[PDB]
Each structure stands twice: as C-alpha cells, then as structure tokens.
Amino acid sequence: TKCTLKSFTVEKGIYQTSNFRVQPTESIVRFPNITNLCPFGEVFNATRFASVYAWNRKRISNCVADYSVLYNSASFSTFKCYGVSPTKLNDLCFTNVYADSFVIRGDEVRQIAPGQTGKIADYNYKLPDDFTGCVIAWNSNNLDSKVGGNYNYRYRLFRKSNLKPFERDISTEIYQAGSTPCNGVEGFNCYFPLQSYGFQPTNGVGYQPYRVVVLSFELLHAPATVCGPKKSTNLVKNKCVNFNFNGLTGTGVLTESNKKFLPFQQFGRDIADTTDAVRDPQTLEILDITPCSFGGVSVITPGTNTSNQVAVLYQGVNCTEVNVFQTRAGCLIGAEHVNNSYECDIPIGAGICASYQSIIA
C-alpha cells in the first residue's frame, strides 16, 4: 500500500493496491483424431520401383502426413533437404507433395541436387536451383540386385539438350554422336540412348542400386491440404488451464455443460461474443468455459500512526479459491468477524464495514 500510494504514511481507509489472478496451471491442447493418413507405404516400400528416365510421380494430397516415421527410420542412407527443415516437416503445411521415385547408381546419388551436374542431372532427372523439399535415398542391394544381373533399370545416356526441372523424356530416338544422317537406323556413330545398369551383388559400394524418393512441395494459392500430425494431450477439467481446441486458444476453467449443441456447431458464444462454451474434438462433449477468478486486491488498514495491522480484500473471489471471512464483496482475510453492529469506519461493501479496536469486520 505504501508502494501504491507513493508515501511512507498511510491514512485510514481501504486501498486497491493490486489485482489477484488465478494463474493458469496446465496447458490442454485437444485436436481431433489423426485419421486418413497419406499413403507413404505404397511409395517408399512399393513392389517394383521405376526407372530414372520414366520416374513415377505420386501426388500426395488431401491427407495428413507423418514425416516423423519417415525421418526416424534408420534404413535411409541419405536424408537431405534443400528448401525446408527436416525437424519442421511435422509443423509446416503444404498444398500438395510430388513424390518422384526412381533407382540410380550409388555414385549418382549426389547428382539429385540443385546446382549439381551429371548424366542423371542433365538427361534423367533435373532439380531446379530454387528447389524445395527433401531427397531421400537408401540402399537396395538385397532387393533390386540379381545374381544374373538386373538389366531392367534403364537410364538415358545421350541427349542434344539438358533437361528442364521436373521434365520427363521417355522417347527412344537414336542419338547422333557424329554428323552422319541417321533416320533411326543405328550405325558406327549412332547409338540407342537408353542403356541398362550393371547392378550385381559382387559390386562394391557405389555401384549398388539405390532407391531414391524425392519429395517436392508446392505452396500455391490452393488450400494447404497436406499438414503435419497433431499431438493432442489429455483433457483436464475443473481447473484454470490454458485450453487450445482446434486452433481456438484461451485461458479458463473447463466444466461440464448442460447446453446441448446441434451436431454442426463447435463453439458457443454469449451476448457479448465471448467464447463461453466449446466442444471437445476428441470426444464430442460440450464444455463451459468459465473465466478464472480474477479480482482486485484491496488493503484495509487504519493509520500507520495508529497501527500496522492490515486486512486484505479479494474482490469477487470466493474464500476457497485464494481470520478468513466470506462477504458478498469478496473474501476478507485478516479481520475477525463479530456479531455486533457499529457505525461504518472503513467501508468494505454489501453492508460490511471494518474498524480497529485488532481489525474487526
């Protein structure tokens, strides 16, 4: 009170000095059920992967994507992102994802990169200089390789011009190494562009087949259907907690509600447009949001020339939520309630007054 009044002596009276707050204890985030997962099991662990000149493009959209399972998998020998962060894939949202799957040689795994120049980069699969997304690659010597040699995986070796980014070329036109006319007829200086790889189990590290899946993100004006997973916590009721329900955040006491919502309605508002009712997304139940018991802290004292004894009034605060006496004005701590009636010395309110004789109310 001396701090509030900016004086070392306090006259007899009641002085509002501070503001009691019921501090929030927990944080409750309730988010709805994580269903309709993106089909990453049929892209990363498919039966047969495609070649690099005819790389398979899978569109990941209208689903929730759990990148933590993909990132925490130890089978992947390369997880390099060029436009995003690996630890922020579960937090960001994108319109759609393009998944480009192919098989290349182990020495060409570095060639799927922005600014990298190679045969796979120029003729088979090209990334832009402003590429966003992540390239994932893992060894597949136990699956793709065959003891007779797996010649099914072809790759383009020759083309007149370099690729544009995200451009396919499944054409089988005979390349002209020299300047002799070739009408599709192979000759001394005219070769077929698609050659087969030499994947064998006797090959060392670098010639083994590597399965590569490249995820590219689009951030167009389409709605962000692809989002990360939501980790909803348990629900705690009857306590002043910080609630976060489906993006609607606040602080309040969440109690059971007798308001029967219609099934399309999620939140509830009073006359003054404040959210006082809400539906939990996990379990379809209706909760009232009572604001925490904020109050004004008033100090009831006589003069400091008389005495240093004080009483504290918490305005509009019940005595179980803070010489303790419950008034209609609030909870009064430090005053002994008596049954006698005197004239009003220090007004408390609602017919209660305080006086010094100790402090009585």
């Binding site: 509002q16 929030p24 404040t274 604001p291 904020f294 109050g295 509009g316 007004p347 309110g349 609602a350």
Partner: protein, 120 residues
C-alpha cells in the same frame, strides 16, 4: 495474459492508473449519493403495532411483515418492475438497509410529523 503486450503497455505510462482512479472516484461517488439521499436520519423509527391513524391507511407504503425482504407492496412492485478485467463492486448499502432507511423515514413522518427532521 500476454507479457509482450504489457511490456509494450508500460511505454504509455500511467494511463491505466488514471482510468482506475476515475472509476474508483465514480464508485465511491455512488455510495456517497446513496448516503446523502437515504441516510438523513440517525434514529431508526418504527410505527406502533396498532395502525390507528384516524382512518388513514399506510399499508401499501409501510413494510409488509409477511415478506422476507421487509418491503412495502409498492416497493416490492417497484423492485419487480426493474429488470476481461470487468468487475462490478456491490453497493455499500444493501436493498434491505435502504428499505430500512425508508421505513424509518415513513415511521418518523407518520408518528412525529416534521419534528423528527428538525430535532427529537
């Protein structure tokens, strides 16, 4: 509960103190207004139990003993006909004590004339 907002609000100084002090002045002014209107007598007068006033009837303005609020029928009708950091402070005088003050004024002006307003 935003701490960054309060840190930016401290740049504007003591505006909040002035608003709180103006509202506190209004709040004590309301109690002073009720004190000046109704608490004009320091003696709580009562009517006699026998209501022999020469034919004059005051039952519609005297308090009804059957009602727990101790209001007159007229006062009961009057009370029936009236229907984010925000707090409402209760008034210092309750409606029962304001009704008691009006009952004392009615008993004084019925039993004693204008003599109770000028002395004994």
């Amino acid at each position: 509960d935003s701490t960054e907002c309060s840190n930016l609000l401290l740049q504007y100084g003591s505006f909040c103190t002035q608003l709180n002090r103006a509202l506190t002045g209004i709040a004590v002014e309301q109690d002073k207004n009720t004190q000046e209107v109704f608490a004009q007598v320091k003696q709580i007068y009562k009517t006699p139990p026998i209501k022999d006033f020469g034919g004059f009837n005051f039952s519609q303005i005297l308090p009804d003993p059957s009602k727990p609020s101790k209001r007159s029928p007229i006062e009961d009708l009057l009370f029936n006909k009236v229907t984010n950091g925000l707090t409402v402070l209760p008034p210092l005088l309750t409606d029962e004590m304001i009704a008691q003050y009006t009952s004392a004024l009615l008993a004084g002006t019925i039993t004693s004339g204008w003599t109770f307003g000028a002395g004994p």
